[PDB]
Amino acid sequence: WKPDEQGLQQILQLLKESQSPDTTIQRTVQQKLEQLNQYPDFNNYLIFVLTKLKSEDEPTRSLSGLILKNNVKAHFQNFPNGVTDFIKSECLNNIGDSSPLIRATVGILITTIASKGELQNWPDLLPKLCSLLDSEDYNTCEGAFGALQKICEDSAEILDSDVLDRPLNIMIPKFLQFFKHSSPKIRSHAVACVNQFIISRTQALMLHIDSFIENLFALAGDEEPEVRKNVCRALVMLLEVRMDRLLPHMHNIVEYMLQRTQDQDENVALEACEFWLTLAEQPICKDVLVRHLPKLIPVLVNGMKYSDIDIILLKDDDTISDWNLRKCSAAALDVLANVYRDELLPHILPLLKELLFHHEWVVKESGILVLGAIAEGCMQGMIPYLPELIPHLIQCLSDKKALVRSITCWTLSRYAHWVVSQPPDTYLKPLMTELLKRILDSNKRVQEAACSAFATLEEEACTELVPYLAYILDTLVFAFSKYQHKNLLILYDAIGTLADSVGHHLNKPEYIQMLMPPLIQKWNMLKDEDKDLFPLLECLSSVATALQSGFLPYCEPVYQRCVNLVQKTLAQAMLNNAQPDQYEAPDKDFMIVALDLLSGLAEGLGGNIEQLVARSNILTLMYQCMQDKMPEVRQSSFALLGDLTKACFQHVKPCIADFMPILGTNLNPEFISVCNNATWAIGEISIQMGIEMQPYIPMVLHQLVEIINRPNTPKTLLENTAITIGRLGYVCPQEVAPMLQQFIRPWCTSLRNIRDNEEKDSAFRGICTMISVNPSGVIQDFIFFCDAVASWINPKDDLRDMFCKILHGFKNQVGDENWRRFSDQFPLPLKERLAAFYGV
Numbered sequence: 001w002k003p004d005e006q007g008l009q010q011i012l013q014l015l016k017e018s019q020s021p022d023t024t025i026q027r028t029v030q031q032k033l034e035q036l037n038q039y040p041d042f043n044n045y046l047i048f049v050l051t052k053l054k055s056e057d058e059p060t061r062s063l064s065g066l067i068l069k070n071n072v073k074a075h076f077q078n079f080p081n082g083v084t085d086f087i088k089s090e091c092l093n094n095i096g097d098s099s100p101l102i103r104a105t106v107g108i109l110i111t112t113i114a115s116k117g118e119l120q121n122w123p124d125l126l127p128k129l130c131s132l133l134d135s136e137d138y139n140t141c142e143g144a145f146g147a148l149q150k151i152c153e154d155s156a157e158i159l160d161s162d163v164l165d166r167p168l169n170i171m172i173p174k175f176l177q178f179f180k181h182s183s184p185k186i187r188s189h190a191v192a193c194v195n196q197f198i199i200s201r202t203q204a205l206m207l208h209i210d211s212f213i214e215n216l217f218a219l220a221g222d223e224e225p226e227v228r229k230n231v232c233r234a235l236v237m238l239l240e241v242r243m244d245r246l247l248p249h250m251h252n253i254v255e256y257m258l259q260r261t262q263d264q265d266e267n268v269a270l271e272a273c274e275f276w277l278t279l280a281e282q283p284i285c286k287d288v289l290v291r292h293l294p295k296l297i298p299v300l301v302n303g304m305k306y307s308d309i310d311i312i313l314l315k316d317d318d319t320i321s322d323w324n325l326r327k328c329s330a331a332a333l334d335v336l337a338n339v340y341r342d343e344l345l346p347h348i349l350p351l352l353k354e355l356l357f358h359h360e361w362v363v364k365e366s367g368i369l370v371l372g373a374i375a376e377g378c379m380q381g382m383i384p385y386l387p388e389l390i391p392h393l394i395q396c397l398s399d400k401k402a403l404v405r406s407i408t409c410w411t412l413s414r415y416a417h418w419v420v421s422q423p424p425d426t427y428l429k430p431l432m433t434e435l436l437k438r439i440l441d442s443n444k445r446v447q448e449a450a451c452s453a454f455a456t457l458e459e460e461a462c463t464e465l466v467p468y469l470a471y472i473l474d475t476l477v478f479a480f481s482k483y484q485h486k487n488l489l490i491l492y493d494a495i496g497t498l499a500d501s502v503g504h505h506l507n508k509p510e511y512i513q514m515l516m517p518p519l520i521q522k523w524n525m526l527k528d529e530d531k532d533l534f535p536l537l538e539c540l541s542s543v544a545t546a547l548q549s550g551f552l553p554y555c556e557p558v559y560q561r562c563v564n565l566v567q568k569t570l571a572q573a574m575l576n577n578a579q580p581d582q583y584e585a586p587d588k589d590f591m592i593v594a595l596d597l598l599s600g601l602a603e604g605l606g607g608n609i610e611q612l613v614a615r616s617n618i619l620t621l622m623y624q625c626m627q628d629k630m631p632e633v634r635q636s637s638f639a640l641l642g643d644l645t646k647a648c649f650q651h652v653k654p655c656i657a658d659f660m661p662i663l664g665t666n667l668n669p670e671f672i673s674v675c676n677n678a679t680w681a682i683g684e685i686s687i688q689m690g691i692e693m694q695p696y697i698p699m700v701l702h703q704l705v706e707i708i709n710r711p712n713t714p715k716t717l718l719e720n721t722a723i724t725i726g727r728l729g730y731v732c733p734q735e736v737a738p739m740l741q742q743f744i745r746p747w748c749t750s751l752r753n754i755r756d757n758e759e760k761d762s763a764f765r766g767i768c769t770m771i772s773v774n775p776s777g778v779i780q781d782f783i784f785f786c787d788a789v790a791s792w793i794n795p796k797d798d799l800r801d802m803f804c805k806i807l808h809g810f811k812n813q814v815g816d817e818n819w820r821r822f823s824d825q826f827p828l829p830l831k832e833r834l835a836a837f838y839g840v
Contacts, residue, residue, distance in 0.1 A: 008045070016060065232274075344377070355367030393412050519536070642681040642683075
């Protein structure tokens with residue numbers, strides 16, 4: 001192609017001075033350069049300088065070819081093919097140029113093209129490399145392989161797709177062969193490639209899944225880190241996939257890995273660590289690592305100390321890597337703690353003694369970390385050493401060096417449960433106090449832990465906080481005008497949580513006086529488009545619930561803002577659909593929060609929302625929200641549907657007609673939360689409808705059972721299922737009673753394990769009416785019903801009696817001597833407890 005020596009003495013200069021030190025000339029020259037991309041003949045200049053102008057010096061040469069790569073990143077859709085096929089040509093040829101630098105540039109352009117212009121569009125490329133992979137010249141081989149890798153990383157499922165007819169078959173053994181090749185670099189290039197296809201559990205490899213396994217071990221003792229790295233990745237990966245192909249040789253490996261954990265190179269150490277996590281999955285662990293235990297645990301802990309450079313990058317959002325080695329170690333240890341429970345302490349506890357009270361802080365910190373890290377797994381066996389260890393940590397919430405006070409917070413919150421169990425004037429009070437101090441700690445980092453650790457504490461210390469409340473808020477609201485970005489979100493959570501935990505006890509005026517102003521402040525200095533509204537509204541929905549009627553001074557504008565945000569978001573949704581290219585895709589977390597914050601007003605205010613509901617097209621709005629494709633929007637609305645039903649049902653009864661079907665559509669346990677909410681809705685709905693639920697019974701009832709008779713179905717959704725069913729039956733007995741037999745099993749199996757509340761109270765009046773109507777449903781499982789009657793500590797007089805009439809009629813019906821036989825089953829904490837309360 002013709003250089004046109006006018007457009008050559010034009011670029012060369014603008015390349016020469018594209019490097020000149022000063023940023024002034026740097027930017028002018030680089031922009032008035034890539035702007036000359038208007039020529040379709042422009043990208044053809046940017047290869048000639050690289051591949052052909054070998055009288056120009058190397059950096060200048062490389063830079064030109066280099067820019068082209070970027071003129072492929074963008075500016076590819078304006079590609080003349082005459083340019084492109086020529087660019088493709090000079091590269092795939094000059095692939096192993098004599099110079100390291102030049103050889104390098106080319107390889108990247110290849111990886112770019114084979115990604116930007118897909119792979120299929122350059123069909124020749126792959127079987128050419130897979131061939132130029134046998135070339136005698138190192139420079140061509142490593143240069144071909146080097147590209148073949150980075151490409152084999154990007155298009156990992158594209159090549160295994162049909163697009164390239166899967167050229168992996170010819171490449172799996174081909175790549176797997178260079179696994180003994182004399183050059184270290186290439187051995188690495190090889191194992192890197194064959195790694196991509198371990199998790200995507202590829203077929204082309206599943207063939208060589210034995211010469212790969214074996215050809216891997218052959219590199220076990222390689223001194224080159226880069227290789228030993230890859231061996232470990234593949235070695236780790238293989239543990240999820242074809243675990244069977246490792247089961248035999250595994251002991252050799254758990255030793256090899258244990259060593260690898262200490263490897264000279266951090267990366268190898270790190271990657272060999274990732275292994276302990278993945279291993280700690282399959283229940284095989286309990287029966288294998290049992291022995292390695294006292295060897296590995298310390299080798300683990302010894303890595304959980306901060307690195308030296310770690311300390312420096314701390315004591316922007318001044319952070320270390322998101323994935324440390326320390327982090328990996330700690331992670332693993334946590335998991336491990338869970339696997340071996342209290343039967344782990346002896347192998348670790350000793351270290352802690354030698355760690356926790358040590359002189360150098362760096363050792364303390366890590367000990368502290370370990371302490372918390374093992375918390376949940378070794379809890380039972382941790383109680384003995386808590387009573388005096390806690391007061392220690394509470395001292396440690398002072399240790400001069402920031403990172404120490406920092407960690408202590410978290411660690412403490414990990415044993416927050418036990419703390420609430422012990423009287424406050426010894427444990428909780430001290431902790432709470434000191435934490436409140438640390439919330440306003442001068443070190444941003446120490447604020448973070450503290451405030452979160454505090455959030456955690458609140459949840460545990462339900463109403464135990466109530467007395468110390470004026471204090472909490474005092475510090476927590478100053479924290480409000482000192483906290484910047486993410487520290488704020490936590491505060492939001494500390495607040496919501498406070499509200500959540502202390503509930504109506506927050507209604508006293510003096511509290512409202514403190515809390516509201518800073519909130520109502522944010523609220524005002526914010527707009528219907530700023531995504532910083534999420535965490536505030538979210539917080540507010542908890543406040544509103546807690547502040548029952550004390551919130552009246554605010555609802556109007558609040559309620560308003562919310563409908564607005566739905567109105568708009570919902571509007572934007574369909575317009576994004578009916579105008580993809582002019583109507584901006586809306587953020588639905590605006591609609592979500594609104595609804596949430598809404599069912600919080602509905603909850604706290606109850607019958608007082610009547611008006612606000614009545615005077616707005618709010619009903620019709622959720623009507624759309626339940627159908628919205630996004631799971632959360634679905635759930636969030638149902639929740640509100642329940643709460644509105646609970647408040648002013650008279651405003652629902654219209655829309656209920658077409659509402660029930662949508663509920664019945666979302667009754668799908670694949671979406672736990674959605675299914676849950678929807679279910680609960682029907683309870684409150686039905687209890688408000690009466691026989692009027694008649695028509696809808698046959699729709700929903702049948703699903704709820706298959707939900708309640710389903711494996712791994714969470715308890716939350718099991719609870720609500722069983723309750724709703726009772727309610728439906730309570731108002732539609734004739735209709736649900738004739739089904740009794742199915743659910744009467746997991747019903748009691750779910751409802752025996754819950755607190756004696758109204759939700760429970762109605763649920764049992766439900767069974768008790770379905771039994772009056774179909775007594776024949778109970779007899780086969782009258783046992784499970786009794787362990788359900790037992791569950792009641794304080795049952796309302798009439799219903800307690802309702803139970804009593806059942807049991808007594810049952811006895812009257814089967815015989816006293818037959819009663820005997822059956823009685824001799826349930827454990828004494830039942831047998832007598834029923835003969836006590838209701839009497840034989």
